[PDB]
Amino acid sequence: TTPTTHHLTIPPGLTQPEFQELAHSISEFHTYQVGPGQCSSLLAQRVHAPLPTVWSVVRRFDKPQTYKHFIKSCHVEDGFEMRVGCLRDVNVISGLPAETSTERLDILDDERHVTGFSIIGGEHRLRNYRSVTTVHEYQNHGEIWTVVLESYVVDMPEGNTEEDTRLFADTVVKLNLQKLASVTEGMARDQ
Amino acid sequence: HHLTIPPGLTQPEFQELAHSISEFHTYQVGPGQCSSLLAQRVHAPLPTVWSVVRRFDKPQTYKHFIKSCHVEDGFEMRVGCLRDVNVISGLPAETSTERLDILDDERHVTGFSIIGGEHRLRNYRSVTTVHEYQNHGEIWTVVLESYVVDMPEGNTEEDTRLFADTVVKLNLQKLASVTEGMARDQ
Ligand SMILES: CC1=CC(=O)CC(C)(C)[C@@]1(O)/C=C/C(C)=C\C(=O)O
Numbered sequence: 001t002t003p004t005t006h007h008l009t010i011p012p013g014l015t016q017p018e019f020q021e022l023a024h025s026i027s028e029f030h031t032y033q034v035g036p037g038q039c040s041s042l043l044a045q046r047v048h049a050p051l052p053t054v055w056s057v058v059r060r061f062d063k064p065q066t067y068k069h070f071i072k073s074c075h076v077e078d079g080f081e082m083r084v085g086c087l088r089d090v091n092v093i094s095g096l097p098a099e100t101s102t103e104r105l106d107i108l109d110d111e112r113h114v115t116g117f118s119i120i121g122g123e124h125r126l127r128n129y130r131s132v133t134t135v136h137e138y139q140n141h142g143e144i145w146t147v148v149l150e151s152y153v154v155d156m157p158e159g160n161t162e163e164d165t166r167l168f169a170d171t172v173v174k175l176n177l178q179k180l181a182s183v184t185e186g187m188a189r190d191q
Numbered sequence: 192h193h194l195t196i197p198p199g200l201t202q203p204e205f206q207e208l209a210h211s212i213s214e215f216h217t218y219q220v221g222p223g224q225c226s227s228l229l230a231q232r233v234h235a236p237l238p239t240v241w242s243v244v245r246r247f248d249k250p251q252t253y254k255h256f257i258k259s260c261h262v263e264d265g266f267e268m269r270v271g272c273l274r275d276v277n278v279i280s281g282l283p284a285e286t287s288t289e290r291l292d293i294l295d296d297e298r299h300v301t302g303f304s305i306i307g308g309e310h311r312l313r314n315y316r317s318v319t320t321v322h323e324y325q326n327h328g329e330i331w332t333v334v335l336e337s338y339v340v341d342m343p344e345g346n347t348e349e350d351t352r353l354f355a356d357t358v359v360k361l362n363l364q365k366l367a368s369v370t371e372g373m374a375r376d377q
Pocket residue numbers: 068070092100101119123124125126131169172173176
C-alpha cells in the first residue's frame with residue numbers, strides 16, 4: 001500500500017520550470033500504490049501543437065494505433081462508445097503471432113484532459129498494467145506549447161528485475177509519446 | 192525484392208539505388224525465411240550519417256531496445272569483431288552476440304549477423320548502406336537497411352516482417368533524428 005514519492009525528481013523530457021507548474025498534477029494523477037511485486041514510472045513529452053489538437057488524439061480509446069507503435073489493429077464493440085468501462089481488443093505486433101491485449105477504459109475526462117486504462121486480459125509479461133495520461137498547456141512568457149504526462153504501475157514478472165521491467169515499459173511509452181508529438185505537431189503546423 | 196519500391200523511397204530514388212540494392216541488400220531466402228528492405232531519408236550530410244552508422248561498438252546511438260552493448264577488450268573495429276548485446280524486451284534474459292560482416296568506409300556499407308543468444312527470431316542478418324541524393328538542389332542522404340531472418344514456426348511471413356519492419360523503421364527514425372540534430376548543431 002506504499003505510495004510513489006514521484007513529484008520530487010524531474011522526469012527527463014521536462015525542463016525545471018515546467019516541472020514546477022506540474023508538481024500538483026503529478027501528485028494528483030501520476031502517483032500510485034506500488035510496493036509488493038510492483039513498479040511504476042512517469043514519463044514526459046513536450047508537444048508543439050495546440051492542446052485541443054493533442055487531446056483530440058489522446059482521447060480516442062478506439063484508435064490507439066494512431067499514436068502507438070506495434071498495434072496490428074484495435075477492435076472495440078459495435079455497442080460501445082467513448083466511455084468508462086468500454087473495452088477494446090488490441091492486436092499486437094511482436095515476435096509471436098497470436099498476441100492480443102484486452103484493455104478497459106478506466107478514466108476519461110474531456111475537461112481536465114485526463115485519460116487512463118488497465119490491461120484486463122491477454123498474454124504478456126506486463127500483468128496488472130494500469131496507466132494514466134494527462135495533457136497540460138504551457139505558456140512561457142510567449143510561445144505556448146502542450147505537455148503530455150504518462151505514468152503506469154505494473155506487476156513485476158517473476159524472475160524479471162524491477163529495472164528490466166520499467167526499462168522496457170519506459171521505452172514503449174517514450175516512443176508512443178514521440179509518435180503522438182509528431183502526428184499532432186503535423187496537424188498543427190497545417191492550420 | 193525489386194518487385195516493390197521500398198517504403199520511404201520515391202521512384203527517382205529507387206532508380207539511382209537499384210544497383211546498390213542488388214549489390215548489398217539481396218539475400219538467399221527460401222522457406223522458413225523472410226527478408227525486407229526499408230529506407231529512411233536523412234537531411235544531414237553523408238559523412239555525418241556514416242560516422243554514426245559505422246560505429247559497430249555504439250549501436251545504442253541510433254537503435255531502441257538496447258540495455259547495453261559490450262565489445263571486445265581488444266576492440267579492433269574490424270570485420271569479425273564481436274559485440275554482446277542485452278536487449279530490452281519480454282524478460283531480463285534477451286541476449287544477442289553479433290559479428291561484424293562488412294565495412295567499406297568507401298562505399299558506406301556496413302553489415303552484421305546474429306551468431307548467438309536467446310531470442311525467437313534467430314539467424315538474423317542485416318546490411319546497411321548510405322547514399323547521397325539530389326532532386327532539384329537540396330542534397331540529402333538516403334539510408335537503406337535490409338535483413339533476412341529465419342521466421343519462427345507458427346509465425347506467418349507477414350506477421351514476422353511486420354514486426355521486424357517496425358523495429359527497423361524505428362531505429363531508422365531515431366538515426367535520422369540523431370543525425371539531423373548533429374547537422375543543425377555544428
Ligand atoms: C507493447 C506491449 C507489449 C506487452 O507485452 C503488453 C502490451 C500488449 C499491453 C503492450 O502493448 C504494452 C503497452 C504499453 C506498456 C503501453 C501502451 O500501450 O500505452
